[PDB]
Scaffold this active site. Structure first.
Site, PDB file in Angstrom:
ATOM      1  N   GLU A 129      38.765  55.953  31.136  1.00 61.84           N
ATOM      2  CA  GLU A 129      39.446  56.961  32.067  1.00 61.84           C
ATOM      3  C   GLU A 129      40.429  56.454  32.711  1.00 61.84           C
ATOM      4  O   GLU A 129      40.097  55.139  33.596  1.00 61.84           O
ATOM      5  CB  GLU A 129      38.445  57.828  32.961  1.00 61.84           C
ATOM      6  CG  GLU A 129      39.224  58.644  33.819  1.00 61.84           C
ATOM      7  CD  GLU A 129      39.888  59.821  33.134  1.00 61.84           C
ATOM      8  OE1 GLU A 129      39.365  60.838  32.551  1.00 61.84           O
ATOM      9  OE2 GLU A 129      41.198  59.634  32.822  1.00 61.84           O
ATOM     10  N   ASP A 163      46.684  59.360  33.886  1.00 64.99           N
ATOM     11  CA  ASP A 163      46.611  59.995  32.702  1.00 64.99           C
ATOM     12  C   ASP A 163      46.909  61.546  33.183  1.00 64.99           C
ATOM     13  O   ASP A 163      46.836  61.906  34.333  1.00 64.99           O
ATOM     14  CB  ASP A 163      45.289  60.230  31.848  1.00 64.99           C
ATOM     15  CG  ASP A 163      44.951  58.886  31.194  1.00 64.99           C
ATOM     16  OD1 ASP A 163      45.238  57.875  31.587  1.00 64.99           O
ATOM     17  OD2 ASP A 163      44.761  59.282  29.836  1.00 64.99           O
ATOM     18  N   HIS A 212      26.017  66.878  37.355  1.00 62.09           N
ATOM     19  CA  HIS A 212      24.919  67.479  37.087  1.00 62.09           C
ATOM     20  C   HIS A 212      24.689  69.041  37.597  1.00 62.09           C
ATOM     21  O   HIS A 212      25.174  69.548  38.316  1.00 62.09           O
ATOM     22  CB  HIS A 212      23.603  66.795  37.559  1.00 62.09           C
ATOM     23  CG  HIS A 212      22.782  65.969  36.526  1.00 62.09           C
ATOM     24  ND1 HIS A 212      22.715  64.917  36.523  1.00 62.09           N
ATOM     25  CD2 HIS A 212      22.099  66.717  35.440  1.00 62.09           C
ATOM     26  CE1 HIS A 212      21.743  64.765  35.489  1.00 62.09           C
ATOM     27  NE2 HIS A 212      21.456  65.707  34.953  1.00 62.09           N
ATOM     28  N   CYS A 263      27.149  69.203  33.545  1.00 60.19           N
ATOM     29  CA  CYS A 263      26.345  68.672  32.343  1.00 60.19           C
ATOM     30  C   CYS A 263      24.935  68.713  32.576  1.00 60.19           C
ATOM     31  O   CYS A 263      24.346  68.705  33.608  1.00 60.19           O
ATOM     32  CB  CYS A 263      26.608  67.153  32.364  1.00 60.19           C
ATOM     33  SG  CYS A 263      28.372  66.696  31.954  1.00 60.19           S
TER      34      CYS A 263
END
Length: 145
Positions: free
Chosen positions: A47, A51, A59, A123
Site C-alpha cells: 500500500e 495511490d 476487526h 474484517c
C-alpha cells in the site's frame, strides 16, 4: 512526503470516523490477524499513500461494540473521515458505497484521474489457507475538494 514504516509494529497513521466514534492508530499492512491484533491496518503490504485508493482494514468483534471497525456502520453518507499521517490530515466524506459486501461492487486501484479515496474494510473469519478474511464489508469515502 508520507511514509509507511517497514517495521510492522510501528504506527503509520490514524484513521478517525467521528459519527462512528472511531479513532484508531493505523499499522502497516497486510491486514493479517497479527496486524489487526495490534490495531487497524492497511489491507495490503505494498500500500502507498500516493495511490488513488488507500485501503484500511479493521476487526468486527461483537464482544466489543466499539472495537476497531465494529461500529463503522454507524457512519452514513456524508460522514466525515480523517486520515492523519505525519505531515497531513486528509479529509474525506463517506459515499453511498458503505457497509456493502465486495460481491456487490468489486473494485481496486483502477482509477485514472478519479478523486482520491479511502476504502474502509471491516474484517472477520480469516482463512489462513487463502490469506483472506471471509467476512468483509466495504465503506468508500472520497476526499473533499
Amino acid at each position: 512526503k508520507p511514509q509507511i514504516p517497514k517495521d510492522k509494529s510501528k504506527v503509520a497513521g490514524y484513521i478517525e470516523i467521528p459519527d462512528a466514534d472511531i479513532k484508531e492508530p493505523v499499522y502497516p499492512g497486510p491486514a493479517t490477524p497479527e496486524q489487526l491484533n495490534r490495531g487497524v491496518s492497511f489491507a495490503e503490504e505494498n500500500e502507498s499513500l500516493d495511490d488513488q485508493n488507500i485501503s484500511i482494514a479493521g476487526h468486527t468483534f461483537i464482544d466489543r461494540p466499539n472495537y476497531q471497525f465494529t461500529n463503522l456502520k454507524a457512519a452514513k453518507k456524508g460522514s466525515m473521515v480523517y486520515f492523519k499521517v505525519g505531515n497531513e490530515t486528509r479529509k474525506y466524506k463517506m459515499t453511498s458505497i458503505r457497509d456493502v459486501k465486495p460481491t456487490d461492487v468489486g473494485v481496486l486501484d483502477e482509477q485514472k484521474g478519479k478523486d482520491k479515496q479511502l476504502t474502509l474494510i471491516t474484517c472477520d473469519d480469516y482463512n489462513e489457507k487463502t490469506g483472506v478474511w471471509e467476512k468483509r464489508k466495504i465503506f468508500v469515502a472520497t476526499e473533499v475538494k
